DNA sequence: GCATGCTCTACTGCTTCGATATCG
DNA sequence: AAGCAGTAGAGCATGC
């Protein structure tokens, strides 16, 4: 519910093409990432990563997409499951009569 | 509406009484609130729709005489403070407005034509705020107020606004029996009025209509013991007030009040050879016959 | 000090005036010489100590008389006239001695400065540099008192600028030279009152000084600039307190970049870190909404007082971010006060700065990019002076027409939306520029018509108007059949194109009927239309008789159809064509007549054209014979948008009843059966329980029968059914009695025998209401109707 | 936050009746 | 303590 409303807030943040709003939104999606690690909701995690990926790949937002591939915002890395001890390898292996008047004057 | 103006006034009294207990750090900010409000209500048009000074008179009347009907439930020591802030704001407004006559009194005109309207709004406002509740509050104010008004009136002679304020202060001084023993302040204010009466009496001979009525009203507001020493100089002002009173009824009122005060308090033999010309101009008022003047 | 000191307080004033006259003669020192050691005067410091120590009890609270204060000011002027005494007076001002009246505290130096304040300030301005140095030496010790004294000195030296204008700049320079001595004020973990005292001190300095806040020179600039930046960029302050560091941002929106980039940076951080999340979502009345509104008001004050692109761009971004911001009239008033300021160069800076907001790429939304022009730039262009509007025009001609000639991309909806929005915005800009420019510098041989071609030219000046009129006409006369992506955005684009066509034709064409060639010409055999492309043919319009909010005025009353953003310029052109140049109907009316009088046209077009005829009826009042059949057709028609006697039918029948004596519907039988159906419809739907509406309907029907009265069949069967209710507890028989009073009011008979009621039964159900003695409006109104009828039947036997 | 009627509710007066206390 | 006629004003709608 409030996750939905703040995802609308994040979409409004990507709606705004200013300078500090991008970092505000990447802080919000980092916060959503941390609380998705600590709420055991990996279905919704893959769902929102696909949501942002398909939204900003049917849209452009080239600068934020550059900071996505420059910081790292990607699908879950573990085993597409509820836990492992795995590094950022999955990030690295996934995304590396008018005619008359026209002269009658 | 009425009975909401009472609520607004209880609100303002509660604010002033709240910050009047906060020491003299905020007791200073009663003064600038009363001052800013007085400047605000004294810059209206001169007499949905626009209000004038006549509507704020009950506000400033309840402010200076109805702490008793308010504080005695609010869970004279504030009446006195608000009276002092009113008189301070009056002579502070007087010593700051620009009242200067420009050759456009042939056709003299105000250099500040907005400050002049503010001053005359202040005069007709203050004509009905000061005469109430004078029985102790004006008595330390008499000398300073009259002295400042006389010095402002000497350099602005043809004003018609300083004689009205001077008539107010000398009527308030007579209401509290200020000139009785005639205290170095009482004799100084006495001799000040003795000299200024003769100065206004000589300079009013050039004046024509409301300058003339203002100087006449000021001279006939003077006490008896200031007139009792120079009765022959003030008697023609009484004849001129009884003559101008046929068309201006307030001037007939101040003439009748002057004559009833003179005939009671001034001596019977200095008054005796002057009834031969004071009384014959009363015959214009006794011309009623109730025919078509029904 | 007391109530009887008048024989012993009269002599101190005398020796005070005596010693003042000695000091004027230049020999106060010779009579009263220094019995003290080096520089203090043994009499002067005794006087200062007397005045200072005699306002406090060492004896409850000495309340000053009116002359006690004036004697104290005289004693104080004498003490300062004896010489020296700046250091002891400053150390008396910064003294943490505490008093009490009866418990409240109020420090001794503060009360002393509050009482006198002006002799003290005149002294402290008389010996300046030692006062400021010894006063800012003790800034940490008593930070409230040094701020109070410096503020008093600074605004007292402001008021004396009519003679001592050199003193204020000296005091400002010396109070800036020691700005390191107040760096403990605008620090972290400082109380808010010292942070606000810095802002007040800076406000007074920047009021009295000029070349401190806007140069990169003079030395003191970095120390004030980091103070200002760190005060308005912090977190520990509050939003409405930080709003009071915005009212002196006028002094800083003139300095050239490098640092102006830093000022934009701290302002944008303040916006993204303190203002609501893009949609004014703070509920109105909470402590968040309050601080937001009072900060934005001071922000708009700063923008309107120091007009700059760095503030206009920022306030236009926050204005044009959502659908409607809270303070719309404030933003519009601030922009209207921005435009009309003289200085014909600095307006074009604002115009180019706010045009670049929607010209460039920076992709946000459709409404965001169109609101940059709509809520801000049109307001600027509609009030900027006429000379500053040709420079902006000449700057935008080439790129405008280069966008207007492009083709869209219907594969991808997003850039399609952006192209629609940009083309509509360009049509709006061209609309206003063609509106408020005279005809010579747009149509004769001038620099603007030269600047669409290369350099100048020799042509008579019609090389812009034609390529724009063809573009406008190809815009507002498109035709979709399978095209279904964005109907709303493209419909608004059609309306903007049509309005730009209006505003271009009302300027350069004046002769006879060049209006007709583009504004009122469709091609249904080629499907090249106008009004179907203008009006939304799907929306349900209401037309309510009664309203919650009254006075929906702009001027023409905006209801729902009257804010179509094409109705007001259409009424403008139609009122224009009446005073530029019977014969039955011109083609600019014959097109509307063929559009209005058909039940095969959509309904919203008929209601739109009807409201146009309503809003300008001084132009159809000459041709009222032709323009009364379709209006009456719409009034007495079947579908009108409401199930009663609504405002549209009230409006049509009121205008037509004004057209009496010019066209009565007694000529043709079509208008006669329309008038009869109109009367039966009005007499059926009268009631509407709000009694003023009931009386209004009755006055409508009465004025209708009084005006026409001839080609009408009174529906006597309906009136019989209206009063024939046999129920002695209902006011339902009052309606038939009122209609009967209406029809008896003019001349007309009761009971024409054609209605199958058999007059005995009719009149018996009429007179039977006399027995219904519960409400006066039944039996007494029935009695008065029977009296009128009986006078009638006696009158004509 | 005012002015004007209109309806209709609630009360009074009169009168009957019945329940209770009292007396030859 | 209830019927029964008579009235007066309380409370409310309404006013564009």
mmCIF file of C-alpha atoms in Angstrom, chain B residues 69-287:
data_model
loop_
_atom_site.group_PDB
_atom_site.id
_atom_site.type_symbol
_atom_site.label_atom_id
_atom_site.label_comp_id
_atom_site.label_asym_id
_atom_site.label_seq_id
_atom_site.Cartn_x
_atom_site.Cartn_y
_atom_site.Cartn_z
ATOM 1 C CA UNK B 69 -16.133 45.920 32.171
ATOM 2 C CA UNK B 70 -13.581 43.416 30.819
ATOM 3 C CA UNK B 71 -10.753 42.753 33.356
ATOM 4 C CA UNK B 72 -13.263 42.128 36.180
ATOM 5 C CA UNK B 73 -13.967 38.742 34.554
ATOM 6 C CA UNK B 74 -10.686 38.242 32.641
ATOM 7 C CA UNK B 75 -9.343 35.605 35.098
ATOM 8 C CA UNK B 76 -7.627 51.153 35.503
ATOM 9 C CA UNK B 77 -3.978 50.124 35.390
ATOM 10 C CA UNK B 78 -4.438 49.248 31.693
ATOM 11 C CA UNK B 79 -6.785 52.167 30.908
ATOM 12 C CA UNK B 80 -3.998 54.484 32.038
ATOM 13 C CA UNK B 81 -1.361 52.709 29.937
ATOM 14 C CA UNK B 82 -3.527 52.721 26.811
ATOM 15 C CA UNK B 83 -4.402 56.383 27.346
ATOM 16 C CA UNK B 84 -0.713 57.254 27.572
ATOM 17 C CA UNK B 85 0.055 55.273 24.434
ATOM 18 C CA UNK B 86 -2.810 57.046 22.643
ATOM 19 C CA UNK B 87 -1.586 60.527 23.589
ATOM 20 C CA UNK B 88 2.016 59.592 22.750
ATOM 21 C CA UNK B 89 0.920 58.235 19.387
ATOM 22 C CA UNK B 90 -1.121 61.389 18.719
ATOM 23 C CA UNK B 91 1.749 63.803 19.276
ATOM 24 C CA UNK B 92 4.121 61.365 17.574
ATOM 25 C CA UNK B 93 1.861 61.408 14.497
ATOM 26 C CA UNK B 94 1.730 65.213 14.756
ATOM 27 C CA UNK B 95 5.481 65.582 14.835
ATOM 28 C CA UNK B 96 5.972 63.451 11.672
ATOM 29 C CA UNK B 97 3.304 64.400 9.105
ATOM 30 C CA UNK B 98 4.192 66.854 6.325
ATOM 31 C CA UNK B 99 1.924 69.909 6.432
ATOM 32 C CA UNK B 100 3.386 72.557 4.111
ATOM 33 C CA UNK B 101 1.604 75.150 1.986
ATOM 34 C CA UNK B 102 2.527 75.463 -1.705
ATOM 35 C CA UNK B 103 1.769 78.443 -3.956
ATOM 36 C CA UNK B 104 -0.317 76.809 -6.678
ATOM 37 C CA UNK B 105 -3.984 82.201 1.767
ATOM 38 C CA UNK B 106 -4.600 83.004 -1.881
ATOM 39 C CA UNK B 107 -4.365 79.533 -3.437
ATOM 40 C CA UNK B 108 -2.021 77.766 -1.010
ATOM 41 C CA UNK B 109 -2.021 73.992 -1.321
ATOM 42 C CA UNK B 110 -0.463 71.016 0.500
ATOM 43 C CA UNK B 111 3.020 69.913 -0.441
ATOM 44 C CA UNK B 112 1.940 66.536 0.969
ATOM 45 C CA UNK B 113 -1.741 66.281 -0.031
ATOM 46 C CA UNK B 114 -1.991 62.853 1.614
ATOM 47 C CA UNK B 115 -0.434 63.818 4.945
ATOM 48 C CA UNK B 116 -2.857 66.735 5.268
ATOM 49 C CA UNK B 117 -5.889 64.485 4.923
ATOM 50 C CA UNK B 118 -4.341 62.149 7.483
ATOM 51 C CA UNK B 119 -3.886 65.032 9.900
ATOM 52 C CA UNK B 120 -7.453 66.263 9.554
ATOM 53 C CA UNK B 121 -8.718 62.693 9.898
ATOM 54 C CA UNK B 122 -6.665 62.547 13.085
ATOM 55 C CA UNK B 123 -8.221 65.780 14.341
ATOM 56 C CA UNK B 124 -11.853 64.740 13.835
ATOM 57 C CA UNK B 125 -10.965 61.336 15.265
ATOM 58 C CA UNK B 126 -9.284 62.725 18.365
ATOM 59 C CA UNK B 127 -12.161 65.174 18.978
ATOM 60 C CA UNK B 128 -14.232 62.289 20.398
ATOM 61 C CA UNK B 129 -11.617 60.076 22.055
ATOM 62 C CA UNK B 130 -9.944 62.567 24.360
ATOM 63 C CA UNK B 131 -12.976 64.300 26.045
ATOM 64 C CA UNK B 132 -14.054 61.041 27.701
ATOM 65 C CA UNK B 133 -12.099 59.791 30.758
ATOM 66 C CA UNK B 134 -9.982 62.854 31.514
ATOM 67 C CA UNK B 135 -10.566 63.029 35.267
ATOM 68 C CA UNK B 136 -7.040 61.899 36.062
ATOM 69 C CA UNK B 137 -5.410 60.623 32.887
ATOM 70 C CA UNK B 138 -4.887 63.921 31.075
ATOM 71 C CA UNK B 139 -3.569 65.913 34.056
ATOM 72 C CA UNK B 140 0.132 65.012 33.602
ATOM 73 C CA UNK B 141 -0.362 65.532 29.858
ATOM 74 C CA UNK B 142 -1.698 69.108 29.823
ATOM 75 C CA UNK B 143 1.534 71.101 29.718
ATOM 76 C CA UNK B 144 3.446 68.947 27.237
ATOM 77 C CA UNK B 145 0.508 68.521 24.858
ATOM 78 C CA UNK B 146 -0.376 72.207 24.903
ATOM 79 C CA UNK B 147 3.263 73.290 24.535
ATOM 80 C CA UNK B 148 3.868 71.054 21.522
ATOM 81 C CA UNK B 149 0.608 72.120 19.896
ATOM 82 C CA UNK B 150 1.365 75.823 20.398
ATOM 83 C CA UNK B 151 4.826 75.458 18.850
ATOM 84 C CA UNK B 152 3.382 73.513 15.934
ATOM 85 C CA UNK B 153 0.651 76.139 15.560
ATOM 86 C CA UNK B 154 3.002 79.125 15.571
ATOM 87 C CA UNK B 155 4.851 77.873 12.487
ATOM 88 C CA UNK B 156 1.637 76.627 10.826
ATOM 89 C CA UNK B 157 -0.791 79.467 11.549
ATOM 90 C CA UNK B 158 -3.502 78.954 8.929
ATOM 91 C CA UNK B 159 -4.154 75.298 9.588
ATOM 92 C CA UNK B 160 -7.670 74.967 11.164
ATOM 93 C CA UNK B 161 -6.500 71.787 12.848
ATOM 94 C CA UNK B 162 -4.291 72.865 15.699
ATOM 95 C CA UNK B 163 -6.884 75.155 17.265
ATOM 96 C CA UNK B 164 -9.309 72.234 17.423
ATOM 97 C CA UNK B 165 -6.751 70.121 19.277
ATOM 98 C CA UNK B 166 -5.933 73.079 21.502
ATOM 99 C CA UNK B 167 -9.626 73.552 22.264
ATOM 100 C CA UNK B 168 -9.762 69.864 23.226
ATOM 101 C CA UNK B 169 -6.829 70.134 25.610
ATOM 102 C CA UNK B 170 -8.034 73.324 27.268
ATOM 103 C CA UNK B 171 -11.543 71.892 27.702
ATOM 104 C CA UNK B 172 -10.057 68.766 29.270
ATOM 105 C CA UNK B 173 -7.965 70.967 31.547
ATOM 106 C CA UNK B 174 -11.038 72.950 32.599
ATOM 107 C CA UNK B 175 -12.979 69.746 33.264
ATOM 108 C CA UNK B 176 -10.469 68.664 35.940
ATOM 109 C CA UNK B 177 -10.011 72.152 37.469
ATOM 110 C CA UNK B 178 -6.441 72.647 36.337
ATOM 111 C CA UNK B 179 -6.250 76.434 36.760
ATOM 112 C CA UNK B 180 -7.304 76.964 40.363
ATOM 113 C CA UNK B 181 -4.393 78.258 42.426
ATOM 114 C CA UNK B 182 -3.175 80.597 39.688
ATOM 115 C CA UNK B 183 3.448 73.337 40.944
ATOM 116 C CA UNK B 184 5.634 75.156 38.438
ATOM 117 C CA UNK B 185 3.982 73.237 35.612
ATOM 118 C CA UNK B 186 0.547 74.753 36.208
ATOM 119 C CA UNK B 187 1.707 78.369 36.134
ATOM 120 C CA UNK B 188 3.907 77.695 33.113
ATOM 121 C CA UNK B 189 0.986 76.212 31.161
ATOM 122 C CA UNK B 190 -1.161 79.103 32.420
ATOM 123 C CA UNK B 191 1.196 81.825 31.180
ATOM 124 C CA UNK B 192 1.682 79.864 27.965
ATOM 125 C CA UNK B 193 -2.051 80.015 27.300
ATOM 126 C CA UNK B 194 -2.196 83.688 28.346
ATOM 127 C CA UNK B 195 0.328 84.613 25.650
ATOM 128 C CA UNK B 196 -1.040 82.267 23.002
ATOM 129 C CA UNK B 197 -4.586 83.587 23.408
ATOM 130 C CA UNK B 198 -3.475 87.082 22.455
ATOM 131 C CA UNK B 199 -1.389 85.742 19.566
ATOM 132 C CA UNK B 200 -4.305 83.793 18.093
ATOM 133 C CA UNK B 201 -6.634 86.744 18.734
ATOM 134 C CA UNK B 202 -4.453 89.011 16.622
ATOM 135 C CA UNK B 203 -3.814 86.521 13.838
ATOM 136 C CA UNK B 204 -7.479 85.530 13.407
ATOM 137 C CA UNK B 205 -8.394 88.984 12.019
ATOM 138 C CA UNK B 206 -7.033 87.880 8.647
ATOM 139 C CA UNK B 207 -8.986 84.609 8.690
ATOM 140 C CA UNK B 208 -12.295 84.052 6.959
ATOM 141 C CA UNK B 209 -14.394 80.925 7.527
ATOM 142 C CA UNK B 210 -13.262 77.772 9.315
ATOM 143 C CA UNK B 211 -9.952 79.212 10.407
ATOM 144 C CA UNK B 212 -12.116 81.898 11.958
ATOM 145 C CA UNK B 213 -14.507 79.411 13.572
ATOM 146 C CA UNK B 214 -11.580 77.346 14.868
ATOM 147 C CA UNK B 215 -9.853 80.312 16.465
ATOM 148 C CA UNK B 216 -13.180 81.491 17.903
ATOM 149 C CA UNK B 217 -13.827 78.053 19.382
ATOM 150 C CA UNK B 218 -10.337 77.959 20.881
ATOM 151 C CA UNK B 219 -10.655 81.442 22.380
ATOM 152 C CA UNK B 220 -14.042 80.751 23.899
ATOM 153 C CA UNK B 221 -12.799 77.487 25.316
ATOM 154 C CA UNK B 222 -10.283 79.448 27.410
ATOM 155 C CA UNK B 223 -10.842 79.531 31.192
ATOM 156 C CA UNK B 224 -12.376 82.478 32.956
ATOM 157 C CA UNK B 225 -9.282 83.561 34.887
ATOM 158 C CA UNK B 226 -7.316 83.815 31.655
ATOM 159 C CA UNK B 227 -10.127 85.910 30.152
ATOM 160 C CA UNK B 228 -10.798 87.803 33.442
ATOM 161 C CA UNK B 229 -7.646 89.873 32.972
ATOM 162 C CA UNK B 230 -8.299 90.914 29.337
ATOM 163 C CA UNK B 231 -12.105 90.861 28.912
ATOM 164 C CA UNK B 232 -12.292 93.639 26.322
ATOM 165 C CA UNK B 233 -10.067 91.664 23.957
ATOM 166 C CA UNK B 234 -12.205 88.518 24.091
ATOM 167 C CA UNK B 235 -15.655 90.179 24.008
ATOM 168 C CA UNK B 236 -15.465 90.823 20.200
ATOM 169 C CA UNK B 237 -14.770 87.125 19.725
ATOM 170 C CA UNK B 238 -17.981 86.458 21.644
ATOM 171 C CA UNK B 239 -19.896 88.882 19.434
ATOM 172 C CA UNK B 240 -18.449 87.222 16.341
ATOM 173 C CA UNK B 241 -19.387 83.770 17.638
ATOM 174 C CA UNK B 242 -22.936 84.891 18.359
ATOM 175 C CA UNK B 243 -23.092 86.351 14.853
ATOM 176 C CA UNK B 244 -21.579 83.342 13.081
ATOM 177 C CA UNK B 245 -23.787 81.079 15.180
ATOM 178 C CA UNK B 246 -26.867 81.984 13.150
ATOM 179 C CA UNK B 247 -25.592 79.710 10.382
ATOM 180 C CA UNK B 248 -23.139 77.508 12.325
ATOM 181 C CA UNK B 249 -24.916 76.025 15.327
ATOM 182 C CA UNK B 250 -21.796 74.581 17.122
ATOM 183 C CA UNK B 251 -20.433 78.101 17.293
ATOM 184 C CA UNK B 252 -23.625 79.335 18.936
ATOM 185 C CA UNK B 253 -23.218 76.462 21.374
ATOM 186 C CA UNK B 254 -19.670 77.475 22.318
ATOM 187 C CA UNK B 255 -20.797 81.097 22.573
ATOM 188 C CA UNK B 256 -23.594 80.263 24.996
ATOM 189 C CA UNK B 257 -21.235 78.104 27.053
ATOM 190 C CA UNK B 258 -18.661 80.903 27.125
ATOM 191 C CA UNK B 259 -21.250 83.440 28.256
ATOM 192 C CA UNK B 260 -22.684 81.209 30.970
ATOM 193 C CA UNK B 261 -19.181 80.595 32.300
ATOM 194 C CA UNK B 262 -18.209 84.275 32.184
ATOM 195 C CA UNK B 263 -21.373 85.508 33.876
ATOM 196 C CA UNK B 264 -20.905 83.046 36.758
ATOM 197 C CA UNK B 265 -17.170 83.205 37.396
ATOM 198 C CA UNK B 266 -15.897 86.551 36.064
ATOM 199 C CA UNK B 267 -16.613 89.476 38.393
ATOM 200 C CA UNK B 268 -19.865 91.367 38.150
ATOM 201 C CA UNK B 269 -18.386 94.811 37.558
ATOM 202 C CA UNK B 270 -15.833 93.912 34.942
ATOM 203 C CA UNK B 271 -18.640 92.072 33.131
ATOM 204 C CA UNK B 272 -21.152 94.903 33.532
ATOM 205 C CA UNK B 273 -20.237 97.381 30.724
ATOM 206 C CA UNK B 274 -20.078 94.574 28.133
ATOM 207 C CA UNK B 275 -23.655 93.330 28.126
ATOM 208 C CA UNK B 276 -24.679 96.275 25.939
ATOM 209 C CA UNK B 277 -23.132 94.546 22.929
ATOM 210 C CA UNK B 278 -23.018 90.890 23.999
ATOM 211 C CA UNK B 279 -26.787 90.587 24.470
ATOM 212 C CA UNK B 280 -28.232 92.442 21.409
ATOM 213 C CA UNK B 281 -26.853 89.820 19.027
ATOM 214 C CA UNK B 282 -28.877 87.133 20.807
ATOM 215 C CA UNK B 283 -31.975 88.596 19.146
ATOM 216 C CA UNK B 284 -31.409 86.634 15.944
ATOM 217 C CA UNK B 285 -32.103 83.354 17.725
ATOM 218 C CA UNK B 286 -35.429 84.650 19.044
ATOM 219 C CA UNK B 287 -37.027 84.883 15.607
#
